[PDB]
Amino acid sequence: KNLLLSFFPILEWLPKYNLKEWLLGDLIAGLTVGSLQIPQGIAFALLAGLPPIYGLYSSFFPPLIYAFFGTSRHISVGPFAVVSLLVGSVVERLVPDDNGTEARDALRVQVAFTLTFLAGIIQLALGLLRLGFLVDFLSEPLISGFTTGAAIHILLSQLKYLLGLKIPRHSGPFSVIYSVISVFHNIPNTNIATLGVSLLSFVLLLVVKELNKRFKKKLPVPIPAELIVVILATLISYYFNLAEKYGVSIVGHIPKGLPPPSVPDLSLFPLVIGDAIAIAIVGLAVSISVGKTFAKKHGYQIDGNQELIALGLMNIVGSFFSCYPATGSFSRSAVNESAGGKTQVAGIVAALVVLLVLLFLGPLFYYLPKAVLAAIIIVNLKGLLMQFKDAPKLWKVDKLDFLIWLVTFLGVVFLSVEIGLLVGVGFSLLTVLLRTQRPRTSVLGRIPGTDIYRDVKQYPEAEEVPGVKIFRIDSPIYFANSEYFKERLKRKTGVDPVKVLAARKKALKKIEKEIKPPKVDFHTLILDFSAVSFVDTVGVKTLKEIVKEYREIGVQVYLAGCNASVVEKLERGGFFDDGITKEHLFLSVHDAVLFAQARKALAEQ
Amino acid sequence: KNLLLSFFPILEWLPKYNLKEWLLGDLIAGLTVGSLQIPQGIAFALLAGLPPIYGLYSSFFPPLIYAFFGTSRHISVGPFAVVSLLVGSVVERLVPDDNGTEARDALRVQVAFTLTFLAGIIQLALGLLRLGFLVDFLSEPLISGFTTGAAIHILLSQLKYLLGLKIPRHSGPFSVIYSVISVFHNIPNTNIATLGVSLLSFVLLLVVKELNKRFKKKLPVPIPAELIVVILATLISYYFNLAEKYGVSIVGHIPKGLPPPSVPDLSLFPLVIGDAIAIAIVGLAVSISVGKTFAKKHGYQIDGNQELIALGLMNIVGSFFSCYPATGSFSRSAVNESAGGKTQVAGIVAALVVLLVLLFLGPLFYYLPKAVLAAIIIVNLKGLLMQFKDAPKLWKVDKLDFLIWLVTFLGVVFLSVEIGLLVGVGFSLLTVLLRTQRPRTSVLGRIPGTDIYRDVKQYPEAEEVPGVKIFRIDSPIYFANSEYFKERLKRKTGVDPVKVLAARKKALKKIEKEIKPPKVDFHTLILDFSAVSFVDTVGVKTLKEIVKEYREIGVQVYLAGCNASVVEKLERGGFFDDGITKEHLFLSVHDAVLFAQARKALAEQ
């Protein structure tokens, strides 16, 4: 049935896969991305405080499970920077660094599995409850701001490994500032040989990337820069023996063999539930953002809910099979697309490459210096750092879009990454109220010899109809802008009905005494409700007050243009039973003007 | 100058005060409200953990300073329930209950003064930065929900004093639940004499209130129920000697003399800054809500910014003069209005009544049982508990307004009061996106023999113009609803321009081969942008994509109705330079239809 095929997209998209013009492309993309996953897999595993094999496990299992339940065709899932940074925070906070080392590592990976499990369960839940429409409220400025800020954190983290300092740091409030001043303090303790292999690594990377970009193809596969750099670096650090002589930090023992089946011990559930909710929300945000981007660019659609189910299932299975939270990334996805990725066959291929490296290659990465991994991560961070080109573009067009970018960026750098995203999303939603809270009110006049009405301040051609005042608000009438609407009505019509009623009563009861009225220039006030999208409870109450106050000073209020929803809420709310009738609701400003002039004339006789 | 008179409203409204038809009313209101402030002043002082004189100080100083800088005419400021509950939380958390008693009380009041100072400074800041427009985003359902929930907390707090139990409790997550089960556990330890004076107090209160309500006036001032009940209770508890014999808890020693000048020791600034921000935000919310309510009902306007400056100055001066955070309340304000309050002369009068009680009366309230204070607080809480009548009314009209009410109410009862307000405000702002995220799209046809166009599914009379497709979205085009807009355009026009371009290219390059087009039913697509309030950066980008994709399948896209702001953002964003021209922007759907038919005809020749 359609439910089982929608709950397992693999069973629907796999038979349709045309083996001739795609298979070659997806194999190329898979080999390219597997060659890129290995070094970054290890790197991001260190950045989360776990041993280095966990990167390879997280690069193998999640892409398989995603290929099965996933809806996107250009996303690459795996161990990503920001989730790795949040996992790391939790690990070292629940397990301080103080036989002993293996005991600490066992408790560390137990914490990591609990995190993966809980994050998977939260993502799965949001997907089953059909709450995936709320990932639409993640603006493009918000995600540009957020990923740029997170790239700053990832850049500062890899400075320490790049020089060879032994600095402790945090990801908490203002932690970037103390972290960079910590690097400025310990710069005299710079290892020279570490900086040497770092700069050698950077030189080899930029040479290989520029060369294989500009020079002739003569290749079905582009030159894997990161892989050959890792290979040359491990060979150099094994021959010249950097590790023991010069004290260059190297990757530890990488064990051979498939992952062991594990159980996330839920004794830690109340300690790590906060950071698991943060990991889940960050995972959804960046996974679905990537999916949507590539889907729009290649002309297809992803299901947000099925994406939350896919990411959730992926993380839960990984949790049991010795992994830490995986997620989509923009960097791998860009590489998987530019290599010629067409389907999730590319993901399956990449995972087979990491599989053969888990089984066979394995301990050849013993003599790999940590400085080469840090340099790889930096050169890959180019992409997200070039998103500072988005701050001026937003500035030129919309200053509130610019402020969403800036607020999220500064929130992420100068506070926590989770707090930065929460503050950004808050401000993102407030900008909608800020746009609608002082709407554009107008008094309309008829264009001479035409049955259309437009603003009199903007079109001096239009003349007001005698005895009829037409007023148009260009917004919803809700809690944010209802007091404003009532004020601007009483200001642009030049009549305050309560002041006029007070004046008339005072005049009539004073002449009653000496024996024993304020000139309103209209008999009808038409309200053009064409641009009134919706009305809330506070609007239906403000509209009832306007219609009553004008009923007391003898003015009829007609509505002209109300859409079906507004007329239904006005009916449920009791607008139509205390002055106004459903027969005072016209189709346009013209029909109301006519009925008004007519009523006046058929009363004079 | 107008600045000094706007920064001191007293100097502007006091000379205009007409001594004949107001002075009598304001004196009555002041005496009534002073008679009500004394018992509640003491009560709310105990609820905050301070000694009982602090209620009287907080009932004296703040109303004076507010009368000087304040813009509202029916607000009564003083010690209020919810602020008292938050102050209490902070005091007992920084100063556990373990000579010793006076030392503890001194450190307790030091914490209270720091809180008052910081809260005042925050309120003052928001007022000077002109950020008082953000108190408009506090919906009426939100404040109904919030005050109803807070009345539940205040009711449960006064149960313990009412029976005579010695239960410790909290205001933290789920604290209501444990607190009521704590009361269910300790109900066998019920003092009988305490319950006796409680029920006697309730009987006297309801007798006096019903009697003085229904029976003849014969009085310029209504009968002060709370004052006579406090007086009878202290006389009874002094003669029959309840305190020592039956063990009934009584109010301690109330000292004679004016407040001592104090200094809030800012050594506690980083401990109490969180709870001071919560106190400030709750104070603004309920003070300005009350001011606005009474202003709307009596036909005047308050300045939000000057209100934040007034409340701030009030709290800072109080901080120095041995007070704890004051704020406006709905209960006192209702009483000050129903008594015949016209100006802040009523506030000055009430503060003079509390002044003479601070100086002279003073220790006559030694034998006052705490159960009588608790009963007074309960009978006053009637008002806010009768706001459960608002849940059905919202339910009937708008279900999102109902959900704002419910979310804030449950947030306040079953989590913290600060968290409840924060969650409520979040959801309040999300409901605006939820209303605009699936807007009402339509395909318009011309009404026969009329130059107006309306929906064809809603008005079967309207016929589509041949060769012209007219589409109208009824909302802003921003990040929340831009993908939706593009989808519904390609669905209701029945043409996907990218699929049609692909089909046409494929057909032309296959016939090119065998030798060596998809029928779009329109040449022009008019977009009625009358109801498009605004466009963000993501809308200008989605509109550029629509206009380009339709330029490739040979269709002209005209815009018809764009307001001046939308056309300016579309111009800054670069809509007008890659297909569309500023001459494709018409004034209404009719002018566009005409220009379209015309262009087609002048091309055929």
Ligand SMILES: CCCCCCCC/C=C/CCCCCCCC(=O)O[C@H](COC(=O)CCCCCCCCCCCCCCC)COP(=O)([O-])OCC[N+](C)(C)C
């Ligand atoms: C504080 C504690 C209290 C609680 C938090 C506060 C509560 C929340 C605060 C809310 C405040 C937001 C108020 C905005 C009201 C709407 C009008 C509006 O903003 O539109 C713009 C004017 O205003 C701007 O947008 C100004 C832009 C520059 C501001 C900072 C630049 C930094 C320089 C860099 C320095 C970098 C580092 C340092 C920077 C930090 C005009 O825009 P426009 O193009 O004319 O038309 C667009 C449409 N609208 C919006 C105008 C209708």
Ligand SMILES: CCCCCCCC/C=C/CCCCCCCC(=O)O[C@H](COC(=O)CCCCCCCCCCCCCCC)COP(=O)([O-])OCC[N+](C)(C)C
């Ligand atoms: C842990 C629980 C957290 C709960 C969070 C609650 C949820 C958050 C809700 C978020 C709602 C909106 C808050 C954002 C306010 C934006 C401020 C703004 O406009 O400034 C802008 C840039 O200024 C910046 O650089 C802003 C940087 C970040 C914003 C901090 C806000 C306070 C919350 C931090 C929380 C601290 C946590 C501390 C650590 C524990 C410039 O101001 P502007 O005036 O627009 O400039 C133009 C001038 N006019 C003409 C427009 C006037």
Ligand SMILES: CCCCCCCC/C=C/CCCCCCCC(=O)O[C@H](COC(=O)CCCCCCCCCCCCCCC)COP(=O)([O-])OCC[N+](C)(C)C
């Ligand atoms: C969970 C963790 C995840 C993160 C948080 C979730 C994220 C945020 C969640 C967001 C979810 C909100 C989705 C709403 C989408 C808009 C449509 C809409 O709601 O309009 C209504 C349908 O829907 C309703 O409003 C349903 C109303 C009843 C619901 C609960 C009743 C409780 C009974 C009491 C029990 C008391 C105690 C127990 C109760 C708890 C229809 O309304 P309408 O009159 O037809 O027209 C109005 C206009 N609109 C809105 C329809 C356009």
Ligand SMILES: CCCCCCCC/C=C/CCCCCCCC(=O)O[C@H](COC(=O)CCCCCCCCCCCCCCC)COP(=O)([O-])OCC[N+](C)(C)C
């Ligand atoms: C300390 C830092 C805090 C940061 C807070 C962040 C800022 C908060 C941001 C707030 C944004 C919106 C969150 C509110 C979600 C409303 C849920 C909803 O619709 O349920 C409704 C009632 O359900 C309820 O009774 C809700 C009760 C409260 C809501 C809790 C939300 C989670 C946040 C709590 C934080 C926990 C803190 C824990 C303690 C430490 C019913 O659901 P519904 O589906 O609409 O029903 C109708 C059905 N359809 C058809 C419409 C579907």
Ligand SMILES: CCCCCCCC/C=C\CCCCCCCC(=O)O[C@H](COC(=O)CCCCCCCCCCCCCCC)COP(=O)([O-])OCC[N+](C)(C)C
């Ligand atoms: C020590 C830790 C403190 C750190 C510092 C102090 C400050 C703490 C602050 C930090 C915690 C950060 C959590 C939120 C991160 C992202 C938030 C965001 O973008 O907002 C958005 C909404 O926001 C929410 O609804 C927030 C959810 C509530 C989480 C807070 C409860 C924490 C306590 C835990 C309980 C306590 C333990 C239990 C019992 C003991 C979500 O972003 P989105 O992209 O829209 O994604 C939603 C998309 N879907 C859902 C629709 C798919």
Ligand SMILES: CCCCCCCC/C=C\CCCCCCCC(=O)O[C@H](COC(=O)CCCCCCCCCCCCCCC)COP(=O)([O-])OCC[N+](C)(C)C
């Ligand atoms: C131990 C404590 C933890 C408790 C439990 C855990 C969870 C913590 C949660 C609880 C803290 C509650 C604070 C907010 C209460 C009301 C919020 C509300 O209604 O939202 C709205 C916006 O929201 C905001 O902008 C929120 C402001 C930021 C405050 C959070 C920082 C806390 C850390 C402090 C720093 C740390 C110490 C410093 C260094 C060490 C404000 O409501 P409003 O009516 O719109 O009023 C605004 C009106 N004006 C401004 C325009 C006039």
Ligand SMILES: CC(C)CCC[C@@H](C)[C@H]1CC[C@H]2[C@@H]3CC=C4C[C@@H](O)CC[C@]4(C)[C@H]3CC[C@]12C
């Ligand atoms: C077009 C894209 C894909 C490739 C562009 C080349 C990128 C990956 C490389 C080429 C040279 C690199 C730079 C070379 C050296 C340094 C100095 C080091 O202390 C910080 C990083 C930094 C500043 C590098 C940033 C990344 C970089 C710009």
Ligand SMILES: CC(C)CCC[C@@H](C)[C@H]1CC[C@H]2[C@@H]3CC=C4C[C@@H](O)CC[C@]4(C)[C@H]3CC[C@]12C
């Ligand atoms: C350093 C981080 C925080 C980024 C900050 C970006 C902000 C503050 C800066 C950096 C780039 C700047 C823009 C760069 C160029 C121009 C063109 C000029 O004709 C008007 C100003 C304008 C449009 C600037 C506005 C302010 C701007 C957006």
Ligand SMILES: CC(C)CCC[C@@H](C)[C@H]1CC[C@H]2[C@@H]3CC=C4C[C@@H](O)CC[C@]4(C)[C@H]3CC[C@]12C
């Ligand atoms: C019209 C308004 C101003 C006055 C109405 C009377 C109010 C103040 C009084 C009159 C009788 C009172 C009730 C009398 C006794 C009890 C039982 C007690 O265990 C809880 C409070 C409760 C339930 C009281 C609530 C408040 C109450 C309803």
Ligand SMILES: CC(C)CCC[C@@H](C)[C@H]1CC[C@H]2[C@@H]3CC=C4C[C@@H](O)CC[C@]4(C)[C@H]3CC[C@]12C
């Ligand atoms: C106990 C607290 C949480 C209050 C909860 C209020 C909610 C859940 C309940 C209580 C009162 C209820 C309303 C009471 C009466 C009616 C009239 C009936 O024709 C339709 C349902 C309707 C409109 C109910 C809807 C649900 C409702 C609003």
Ligand SMILES: O=C(O)c1ccccc1O
């Ligand atoms: O690739 C990403 O999405 C990314 C996001 C934030 C920080 C670093 C990153 O590589």
Ligand SMILES: O=C(O)c1ccccc1O
């Ligand atoms: O009077 C109020 O505004 C109030 C608000 C919340 C709780 C108790 C109260 O008296």
